[PDB]
Design a protein around this motif. Structure first.
Motif, PDB file in Angstrom:
ATOM      1  N   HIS B  63       0.959  -1.178   0.017  1.00  0.00           N
ATOM      2  CA  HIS B  63      -0.012  -0.092  -0.028  1.00  0.00           C
ATOM      3  C   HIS B  63       0.950   1.166  -0.145  1.00  0.00           C
ATOM      4  O   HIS B  63       2.103   1.282   0.499  1.00  0.00           O
ATOM      5  CB  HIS B  63      -1.130   0.093   1.128  1.00  0.00           C
ATOM      6  N   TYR B  99      -8.027   1.744   5.145  1.00  0.00           N
ATOM      7  CA  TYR B  99      -7.512   1.392   3.897  1.00  0.00           C
ATOM      8  C   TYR B  99      -8.633   1.620   2.574  1.00  0.00           C
ATOM      9  O   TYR B  99      -9.622   1.356   2.912  1.00  0.00           O
ATOM     10  CB  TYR B  99      -6.880  -0.008   3.615  1.00  0.00           C
ATOM     11  N   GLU B 109      -3.585   3.710   2.310  1.00  0.00           N
ATOM     12  CA  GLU B 109      -3.712   3.706   3.288  1.00  0.00           C
ATOM     13  C   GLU B 109      -3.846   5.015   3.686  1.00  0.00           C
ATOM     14  O   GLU B 109      -2.972   6.282   3.589  1.00  0.00           O
ATOM     15  CB  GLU B 109      -2.462   3.194   4.221  1.00  0.00           C
TER      16      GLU B 109
HETATM   17 MG   LIG Z   1       1.311   0.736   6.137  1.00  0.00          MG
END
Ligand SMILES: [Mg+2]
Ligand SMILES: [Mg+2]
Lengths: 111, 112
Positions: B63, B99, B109
């Motif tokens: 992410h 998220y 995120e």
């Molecule tokens: Mg992270």
């Protein structure tokens, strides 16, 4: 094809561009530094932003961005208010409110 | 050492990834090459380039993170994403984090 272009002189191209991207979903297809930005909507309308303030727009001058529903009008109103812009509740005539865009021109938001 | 200042993020759809990053994260596009490529910038000068790819897949835990100045700001992005039709759960205190699966096929995120 009628009216498809507006060249809006503004005080700050960068600020006006970012406002239009965030709240109104316009896309930038080009720039010349901070002097010039070409904004487009989905229907090929071209709204160019150009630096160089000498004068204020007439007070009743505005550019109108219609919305799909009254809920969508309310959403933009709410988020503008939360994000520090000076707005009042929309009114029923269309369901409408106004906001002063960074750069120095008024936007109409309506359904 | 000057650290990490560029990410080239392969995506399924550059146009869609760009508009999402503009709307929700305030990134600014400094250039494109057709629909294949877009150069995005944040406020600190980090360069995120979006590049069209085929069959784009990231590891499940990959992410990109966008820290916020406050927990109220995390809540706001969460609320707006939810209202706008993105599937997000409320933020959790783990940082205060959630998220979101972003247009173009990668996870973002959001935390404080
Ligand atoms: Mg992270
Ligand atoms: Mg009018």
């Amino acid at each position: 094809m009628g009216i498809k272009h507006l060249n809006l002189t503004v005080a700050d191209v960068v600020a006006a561009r970012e406002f239009l991207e965030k709240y109104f979903g316009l896309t930038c297809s080009g720039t010349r530094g901070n002097a010039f930005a070409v904004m487009r909507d989905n229907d090929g309308f071209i709204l160019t932003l150009m630096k160089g303030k000498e004068v204020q727009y007439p007070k009743t001058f505005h550019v109108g961005f219609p919305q799909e529903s009254e809920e969508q009008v309310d959403k933009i109103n709410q988020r503008l208010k939360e994000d520090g812009f000076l707005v009042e509740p929309p009114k029923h005539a269309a369901y409408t409110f106004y906001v002063e865009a960074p750069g120095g021109f008024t936007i109409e938001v309506m359904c």
